[PDB]
Specification:
This is part of a larger assembly, with two copies of chain A and one copy of chain C.
Chain A lengths: L17 E6 L3 E7 L4 E7 L8 E5 L5 E4 L3 E5 L5 E6 L7 E4 L8 E6 L3 E6 L3 E6 L4 E6 L3 E5 L4 E6 L7 E7 L4 E9 L8 H8 L6 E4 L5 E4 L4 E6 L8 E7 H9 L7 E8 L3 E8 L13 E4 L8 H5 L7 H23 L9 H25 L3 H8 L5 H13 L3 H18 L2
Antiparallel strand pairs in A: 1-2, 2-3, 3-4, 5-6, 6-7, 7-8, 9-10, 10-11, 11-12, 13-14, 14-15, 15-16, 17-18, 18-19, 19-20, 21-22, 22-23
Helix pairs in contact in A: 4-5, 5-6, 5-7, 6-8, 7-8
Chain C lengths: L3 H11 L9 E4 L4 H15 L7 E3 L7 H4 L9 E4 L7 H4 L13 E3 L8 H4 L5 E3 L16 H4 L4 H21 L11 H12 L4 H13 L6 H4 L2 H10 L16 E2 L17 H10 L8 H8 L10 H4 L5 H8 L20 E4 L1 E6 L3 H10 L5 H18 L10 H25 L3 E2 L4 E2 L15 H10 L14 E3 L12 E2 L16 H9 L23 H8 L6
Helix pairs in contact in C: 2-9, 8-9, 16-17, 16-18
The chains are: A alpha+beta, C alpha/beta.
Protein name (chain C): Cell division control protein 45
Main location (chain C): nucleus
GO biological process, one term (chain C): double-strand break repair via break-induced replication
Chain lengths: ~425, ~425, ~550
Amino acid sequence: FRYMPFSPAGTPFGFTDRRYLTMNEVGYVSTVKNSEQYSITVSFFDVGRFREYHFEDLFGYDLCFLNEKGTLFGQSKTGQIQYRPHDSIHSNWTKIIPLQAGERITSVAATPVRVIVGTSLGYFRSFNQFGVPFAVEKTSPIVALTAQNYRVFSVHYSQFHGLSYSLSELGTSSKRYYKRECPLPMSLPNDANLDYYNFNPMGIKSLFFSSYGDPCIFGSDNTLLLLSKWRSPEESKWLPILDSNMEIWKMSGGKETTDIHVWPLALAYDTLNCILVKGKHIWPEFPLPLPSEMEIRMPVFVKSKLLEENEIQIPVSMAAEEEYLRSKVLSELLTDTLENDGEMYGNENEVLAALNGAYDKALLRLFASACSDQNVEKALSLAHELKQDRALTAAVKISERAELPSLVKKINNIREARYEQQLK
Amino acid sequence: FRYMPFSPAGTPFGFTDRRYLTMNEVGYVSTVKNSEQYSITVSFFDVGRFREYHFEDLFGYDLCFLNEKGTLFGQSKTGQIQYRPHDSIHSNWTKIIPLQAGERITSVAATPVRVIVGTSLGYFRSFNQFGVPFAVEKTSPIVALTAQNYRVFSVHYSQFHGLSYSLSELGTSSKRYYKRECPLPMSLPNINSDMKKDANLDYYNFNPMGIKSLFFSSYGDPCIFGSDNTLLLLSKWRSPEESKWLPILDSNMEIWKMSGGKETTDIHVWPLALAYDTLNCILVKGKHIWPEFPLPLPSEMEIRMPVFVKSKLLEENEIQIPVSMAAEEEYLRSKVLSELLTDTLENDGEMYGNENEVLAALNGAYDKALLRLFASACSDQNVEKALSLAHELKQDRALTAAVKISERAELPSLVKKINNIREARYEQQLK
Amino acid sequence: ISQFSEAYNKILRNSSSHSSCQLVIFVSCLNIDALCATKMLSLLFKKQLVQSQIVPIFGYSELRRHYSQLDDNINSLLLVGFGGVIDLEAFLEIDPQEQSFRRDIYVLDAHRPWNLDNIFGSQIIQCFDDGTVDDTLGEQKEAYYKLLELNDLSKRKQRKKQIHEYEGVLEEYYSQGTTVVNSISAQIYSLLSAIGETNLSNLWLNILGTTSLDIAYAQVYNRLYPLLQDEVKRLTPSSRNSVKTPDTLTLNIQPDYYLFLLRHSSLYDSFYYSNYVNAKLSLWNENGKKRLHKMFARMGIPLSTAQETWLYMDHSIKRELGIIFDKNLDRYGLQDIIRDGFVRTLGYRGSISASEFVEALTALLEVGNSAQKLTNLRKRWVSNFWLSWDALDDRKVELLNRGIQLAQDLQRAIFNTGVAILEKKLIKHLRIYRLCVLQDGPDLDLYRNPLTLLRLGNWLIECCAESEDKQLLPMVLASIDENTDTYLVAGLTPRYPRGTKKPILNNFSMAFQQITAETDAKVRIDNFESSIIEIRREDLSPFLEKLTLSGLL
């Protein structure tokens, strides 16, 4: 195995002399090669907030990470790093990380109060915002890093066992571990495609943290994985709430192309930000693409059934099952976030009220279909999943219209049982 | 690494066009292929309660799992599943699970309140008894499943990892984990170069992991039986950091003792059911290790701890074991069973209503077997070894019997040491 | 002392209101580089959404009548290159009023002699002092610093001599000739890069001004041969050609020549300014009007396919000159022709480089239109300035070629009389310089506006650019068109034939202070640039008698 330098949302060179160093919601950092040196150009999307600047690269940095306060650079061959803050008040600092024979820096990370540097031999060296060292730790080799505030999330991959991930928090008292090298369910891969595989042996396109406190990962299998309930190890699980193949197929009309990929940028509570790249290569080049937004969809479909019923269109009855799965995951995560962290924007209550109303409404469409096919028993289990008290009243009217008097009395027993538990 | 569809106690075709889909304590499900389709006939051991029936298959359902309430069928290629209840109250239902290119259903499971469908990519899709879909969970690829009406037990394995075990329960509100992906050190099958022309090559091609059968016990303990012919039982499953695997049975020593010290390979053990003291099996005689059409009568085989020497048994001579040697094996067997039965009653309570008589008889035989080793230590004048054996006694009446063995062996210093243990236990009991 | 990002944010908050909080900038029109620096500053002030007011000023005596009479609440005055030599705070009194003052100008002076008060002792004159000169007369830390505060009969007597020791180092200093060391293109473009705004129009704009100084000095832009190279590669728009895009303004590099405006047109009127290049060799007419006819009429120059042959398949002939002058390289060795240069295109509408482009801007600034005539002469040059500033859009196309066809007659006009004053033989090397007085010829009207005069000297400094291994001194000319003998006399610089080792800036402005200090008998320095003054007819003859003895070089 060869330890290649990894960067968040980076693209390889290909047949050109320029590429993207890093890419996130703040902006993008790229490099332009000239006759004797390298040239780093940093461009942002929000031109009105920060000042755009550029400088010549004499040392030849190949690693970069961008956060809301500065830019960190790192050299894998000589171990020389440099942190450049956007404000002129803070001064620049340069320090050389010691490296052994054959040791290369594979991934870097930066937070405004701590600096995280990972190597191929598993050396964990942590610095503060001024360069003062605190501790030297020996762990598994880190191949990927992402951070929002305090948290350190490292992906580990050894020579023999490999494929694991760790989750930690750099608190004021001591470093606390929530997960200790749990196995990663990401699928490994079994010319544009050939060149990308060598530079990126694991196929990790991009990785970032969500705005609501949950870690997200996007592997080579093009499935958006959502880590829910990370504060409790008893109920911590991965949730694939979005499937790439289903979203492209429904919007286009019922076909499936090859040259239209989905590169992830950010996720801010409703849609996944992306760049529509059209061409042979899977990596973008220089034009300025407009950012697009894709609506989140659960990957639950059949392929033979969609062709018989015919941009490909989905009917009413089939979409009620997908709407039930999507609303159930989002309502549970939003409830636990507000009861533990509170409000963040100030409009979470209107989102929660609209989501809970659509959840009970979508369940009634499946409830009406069960009564039409005379399945009284399947209709009984659907009534217990209702949350609001007004949804139970609406279930009685669907049952009386379908001429089922025994189903009507069963709804009333659920109502009396919830009122007794509420008074205890 | 290409996977294979796994079923509980499934047998391959071999040199025929017919095989068994699944096999358990309820009954057996077999299929007969006559040149165009499959004919699934489900037979049971209890002819009095249920009625034997059969039907014609037009989809080729190879994955099956049988429980006390119904029969589940699954298709690894198209993803079409079907559940058939035995009683006439509930009606049949058909649903097609969507599957991508490459992805196939490897193992299915069925409980009366939850439906478990596992895939080759590790997608965990769970359904209820009415068909309402739940949340989709992405985990490691599942290769083996077993359940007994309430919990989900998954075994994970890939090409860059190794065999593991997970224990979870599908509750009414959310999924709760007892054990989450802990490593399982079960040995893999070692296929050599001479196995390519052997007649048992067909069994390993349908099941590369070598998992012959796996099921839960009558008292709720997880069990697994791999290709290494050693029955492994999971002890202390209520504590995640204290969970241990304890081998209480081995077939490789029992065949040699019953055959009079021979070296034949025509005798095997196929596990069907285990209710705390006897593993039900079928004595298959022949070259093949898998059963075929008509099943012989079931025999009874009591569990024995695999602690023997091979050179010592030949010098002392069905092979017979003496009194003195069997006391060490009886002590190891009774110690494991008494600890598990005590923790089961203090946390789950009674299940049949006769657990107290089993516990009283087991504790009496435990103290009695320790006295045989205690008498042997006094005869060889080892006073110090006899002191450590006295501390392992549970009942107060066993301490009185140890005094009489010590006085007969003419050891007055050993007598007073037994009385100090008696005074120490009475002081702790009053606190 | 002024970090470049700091003054921008500081001048931002001082006038950013939606009222008459008007900041106003001033610019001279007498310089091409003075224009192009200001144009890029205005447009970023548009997209930073501030109100403004732009006024040109052509005359140095005019500055009082344009500022010191009309002010209400202007807090932020801005100015481009006016007061490196004369102190404006002595020229204009500003009393200290309201240490954290009430109205603060900046300055963007580009010249070599500075003024010590304007950097040290700064209270309203916030000058541009960043990493421009790190050695801003580094010996000054005790001269004026002890001039500010100035038994003791033997002690103070020594202390007066130390002041007199400080007096000489302030006497040799403030007695130097002037140039521009660094163009104003260099400063503000570096400032915007500290802010970081990526537009190739800027990169097209900043290179224009430094291209203008290619005919006034040599090694100033020779330092900028890397800084042209890195930016066009760091601001690489594309790796492919990505053809048939009418937009996107692609930037490349291609070789080019002293023989100029070729890609626009006229290999015909190249024949004149090929003989300009042979005027750089050893002649002006004689051998060349034979010698040109080995290298030129080899192809008769057509009418219709000459839109194609000296546009396109002259690339077979530019190659052919490229394979002619490679064998004129180890043998001729005249390296005034092959040059690296720079070019741009518009997607369509022809390829236009920046060599010829500065040429159109000079001529279009020229033509394109008691004491009662000078007012109606001064209102012209401001007005015709104005139609050149809007030349930097795509919206001017059919006015762009207007200067082009204007330029290729003005040289034919200026060469028509240069050949006359040679053959008259009225250049006289008296002792130091050479003096020429164009008393009267034809077409005297094109010598009022001084921008033609430096070009006439630029042609005339090169007639004497032979070996001349003694007396490398430029000339002083004379001409008159209007009443009372105004006589816009001027001086030139000596030139080097691409071998500056000696420090040759100017000696005349030192003498120009002398004659102006003598009698004040109708002498004028009201024109802006110190290299041009005026004289009376009966004063030019005692002018030179004061100059043939006052050897100040």
